[PDB]
Symmetry: D2
Subunit: 421 residues, 4 copies
């Protein structure tokens, strides 16, 4: 079946009640049928329900469907997109190791990687997605992951995935792609050799600014890269937390297994059932929604691009954009999602715009059905240094927009009056 | 002003425009800033307020403050789970190269987190015996950033002599962390005895119905006094690059909680969902009445087990022969000891028949549910522990742990009776 | 088998495939029939089962059966609200041209429903005094299809002498309906005293937290005996065209509840949403412990008000001087009288100051919330104040009322 | 001002103190009045505002007003279900001894409600043929209080010639009620054609995912003009004892909606729960994009069925040979006909094999779910499909294998 169909059917066979909609398991524990069954589950001998901090049936449906839509093998939902980025990195790197990360990513993920992970003895090494030789340069035998975004936030920078893959495969390093903005419907990183995909479900999957959540998805056959690979000992050595169990002995997606038995179990960034359920509902309609977000974004982009009071527009469909060729190369449906940014005349103009819009809501989020607006320098990328901003391509006049599902003429009119004030 | 029961029902909520008596469920991730200054000001910690739900949410804020109010603390922060709360409390104090001291009698999951999982982040764990505090002095050095223990342990039901832990902790200027999950704030108030930070698995008694996973970190009043200008905690006294040189010791705010928000929630994201937060608020409202029934039932079940010939030992603090009975009388003002207890069956085979025979006690892995629960720890909750660590925590192959629910005690006793006698 | 407290926690739920201890929330409207026969069979009442949530939902089914179990009845049906429950109970018995007898001491909304709104449907209402039952005999005729009253009235806190109502009802072969909302199934069991149908506003004590609007209709065991072959109830003994001639008296099922489903829920649609049903199930689990606190607190507040010089009269059954005290001792086995009470202030102006001065008692229109509530509502006067006693600390409550009263 | 798509996303919501972009879920039954006067004033209809959730709730209020906004109406009231909405609309107009005129081509449940269940309340029902409007003139008398029909019928997919119904209704000064559930406010706007009251089963397309049962009654702008001083509707022109003699014709408010609240919701209690209302609001936000996919998919499935040799007849308005095609072109401005359609199998046994063989079309009784559905309700060979949001090729393939074997 096609992706649209897989977001609606699969990973749910109807329990006894045969409800068409997936039930909401607002529950933490399960009744084991007998003591053997219980103990067997605690020993990984038998798979099954144990305790919601580890897994929940509502969230399991979500995980598998997300994996199905991406063309991957297994997916794991967590409390948030950040938790997903965090879990993906620590599942690969531990104290004394380093990770390579793109210089054009979400501000929060940047802070997590370049500052917060130090506390755990994990070194971060920045690289430029626009000049991949810079990636080869920071790689050593201690580099455990290569992290980047498919379509960056807020520069809307597109990564040349095939080239990142080449380098990653060569050194036998796990590649992590945050495909949040593009969504699995506009881009399928797995098709291009990506090992692990992370998503902030909180954005487009929800599509309505109502459910915070994240997911870690692994490709098919990822064990091939982790098993018997000197770069990843955690997956090839007896583990004392599990009475000597060695993950390379399992015929299961070991990356996902470790996320469950270790990170969810001990760190506990668990996705609540109600959020999981809402996210499932959003997943069902994402295919239709992302197209509208895209169509609207393009019109807004064309309008901003021709207006005299605007000094520059950042959106991949624009033929003059630096990522336009990469866009045509990797986006099969010719839709570029709903995020875009533009340059106002100056700081004072950017501020007047944010204070004058009536439909674009001044807020810090993206992928909501309602259009949103923000000024990154003093907000989302407020933590970054004055120079890091320039490396990511942001200025004091920069405005970021999250294009919603409203009528395009109404949106254009709202931006027009704000801009012209 | 008011009593605890009252504070679990009123407070930290003004009634918005609609004046709904119940706290609204903010199933929402973002907020509409009134203007650009306001926004930027919030991102700079100049003005406090709503920004994004991964950091804070109004539904969960009411929960945090009320939990703090019932404990007699200053500020509280709900997180996705009890484990997340334990994790966040430790990392907010220790970083790579440091060590933490922890009780040998705690929740299995927390034990794994501390003794194994934290190694991955370069955080050393040093076990100590709550029954012999000299063992605590012994493992302390200038790199020790936290002293962790449970007020009423899971599953031994071991009571910590809080005042003595406090003495040692205050002497070395170390932050003490107490997991008060089982006792609940209604049976015991660790802050009264010098505890600095309290963690709770809200998932257990606060929920009281096995429906909402959640955790909370609560800090005492004046905790800044201990963190500010203390060489043992540089993260709270040095310009932070993640925040353009901001130095937390400069703030007139609960800095422990602030760091949890601006750093751990913001970057690690173990955020508590709004629906769970709301359900937990509801549970908090009734915890005072519920915990008393749980306690009354537990005591009757304990007395019954204690007199039955097929039972070899019972662990519950109300029993006069119990080793923690004096500590119980010393720290528990309402003479209720909560709903968790454990007992020894004749042997492994007997413990297993019991688990397979009960009809009301549900074989499951959780505690504090309104429905009674049962489990065999060695092969389950403490399955990860070594054969010797089990003995240091006091668990055997014949050990059974029970979570006493709100059902009728005669019905519960009868269910255990038939299971035990077969 | 088990006690009430236990039945509110175990029963009517056997764990699906996932074996979740908590009942799942079926936020769902339709079900996947396994095959066409199964489907058609369900639409014909040949096979019982899931069809569409407007009729029934598994989450709400657990609630219905447990409520029935705690009351000692046979089957229960949850609906959108207590009002809907009262409405559905009456219309399931009376149709245009019939009449219903109702107590003069009941919930205002129910009084309006019965004495005014039902006229629109050609249903006559005939009031009777619960304190003088001869008045009931008087209004009864062969067209009287129901006798409605409250076990513990709102806001009078008037207790009905159930046995005597039952006698009269059983004699004439008329279905008796008891609204047991305030007393709750834990303080009083109307079925023990001959009641046929029990209605509850689940919105009040079952929820116990002012969060879920809901109602329920519960029928006693063997109610068919009274409905089948009874000339007073032709709807249950005549082929029905809406169901291809089906005659309910032919069914080995609780026909009263069946009609509520296949007709009133199906066509009028006052369905109880799954989130509400689930919350109500949660509340049901803890009602036994909660109602005792509500009761203990109410009694202390009552005693305090009863001794304060600025208060002119207190209405609560535990007070030995109260007119319903003997009826209280006769029907309430635990010695708890719930959390509703009323009292007389010095006068209208005093009653207002009180409502405007309380800090814990919240000025609002509801009852049975965990938070204490207050309001200024024929059995009532301009000085009358009604209180809904919450779960707060009694000393705190008393202190809040003391400062309001003394201002 | 704005377009419909925009109105489904913005409006009727202020941002309370917290300024949450999403509408909060008021899982609550009561409200804290600020003082005694305020309270009493609300119980007397002097001041509008929150009282008790059985009557109104802020979450559901946003839904009501937005639904009204998208339809181009004045006020909307959500209720527990579509049936409850139909019921409430009728009884708000007719009482014992009156009669109502209803279309012979409507939802089965509504047909039962009107032709059988309402008898219990002394309300007579008189059927009429939407395809032959003279039949409507015929059943009308001075006791006829409502004219009920569907814009796009279920399961016939029969389109009503609204203008002609309106003509007749306006002439006799009778309130017209249009169930616009299947078409949705995005494909058809009955108010544009003189309809007085619109009912919707929100449970279907507005939810769009089979998760929230709900209904709504929406009234047009200026409906008072038709109700006030109209001898046909005394309930809206006589002192009411339930409200201490209050006479509704004295109010500067949508009196039709007011009565639904102060009388039907208050006393009958078919209240819409907050969680359902909130979910429905979420569905409303995305209905515009969803209904187009449902429509595009339906059309393709219809064309496929229409050309397959094992299929004997297809019922969908976009098909040029369909009897309602001209009416479709006349009333549907976008050229989308929603996701409901029906077709004739070879015979009863074939219709049954199909229902038992589909893997994507789920054998169930509902419509407007994002997942495609199928059922056997008109003839013995008739099959009714609810076209979902799945990929059309996948849907066509599933039906192809079922039909062919």
């Amino acid at each position: 079946f096609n992706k649209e169909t897989l977001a609606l059917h699969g990973a749910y066979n109807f329990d006894t009640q045969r409800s068409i909609s997936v039930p909401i398991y607002q529950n933490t524990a399960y009744n084991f049928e007998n003591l053997d069954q219980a103990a067997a589950r605690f020993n990984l001998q038998e798979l099954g329900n144990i305790y919601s901090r580890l897994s929940n049936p509502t969230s399991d449906v979500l995980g598998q469907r997300l994996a199905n839509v991406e063309g991957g093998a297994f997916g794991i939902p967590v409390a948030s997109g950040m938790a997903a980025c965090f879990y993906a990195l620590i599942n690969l790197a531990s104290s004394g190791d380093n990770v390579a990360y793109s210089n054009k990513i979400y501000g929060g993920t940047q802070t997590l990687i370049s500052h917060t992970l130090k506390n755990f003895g994990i070194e971060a090494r920045e690289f430029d997605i626009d000049d991949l030789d810079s990636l080869e340069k920071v790689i050593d035998q201690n580099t455990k992951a290569i992290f980047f975004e498919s379509l960056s936030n807020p520069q809307i920078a597109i990564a040349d995935i095939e080239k990142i893959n080449q380098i990653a495969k060569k050194h036998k390093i796990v590649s992590i792609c945050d495909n949040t903005v593009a969504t699995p419907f506009l881009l399928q990183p797995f098709k291009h050799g990506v090992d692990v995909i992370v998503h902030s479900l909180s954005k487009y999957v929800s599509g309505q600014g109502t459910a915070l959540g994240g997911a870690l998805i692994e490709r098919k056959d990822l064990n091939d890269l982790l098993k018997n690979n000197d770069r990843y000992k955690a997956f090839n050595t007896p583990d004392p937390s599990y009475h000597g169990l060695n993950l390379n002995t399992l015929d299961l997606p070991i990356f996902s297994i470790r996320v469950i038995i270790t990170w969810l179990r001990d760190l506990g960034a668990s996705l609540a059932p109600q959020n999981a359920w809402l996210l499932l509902q959003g997943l069902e309609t994402l295919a239709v929604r992302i197209e509208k977000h895209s169509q609207n974004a393009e019109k807004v982009a064309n309008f901003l691009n021709s207006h005299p009071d605007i000094k520059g527009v950042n959106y991949p469909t624009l033929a003059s954009n630096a990522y336009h060729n990469l866009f045509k190369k990797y986006f099969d449906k010719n839709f570029a999602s709903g995020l875009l940014s533009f340059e106002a005349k100056d700081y004072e103009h950017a501020r007047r715009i944010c204070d004058k819009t009536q439909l674009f809501l001044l807020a810090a989020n993206l992928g909501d059905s309602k259009s949103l607006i923000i000024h990154p320098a003093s907000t989302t990328h407020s933590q970054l240094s004055e120079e890091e901003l320039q490396k990511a391509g942001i200025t004091k006049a920069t405005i970021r927009l999250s294009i919603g599902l409203e009528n395009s003429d109404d949106l254009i009119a709202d931006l027009k009056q704000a801009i012209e004030s």
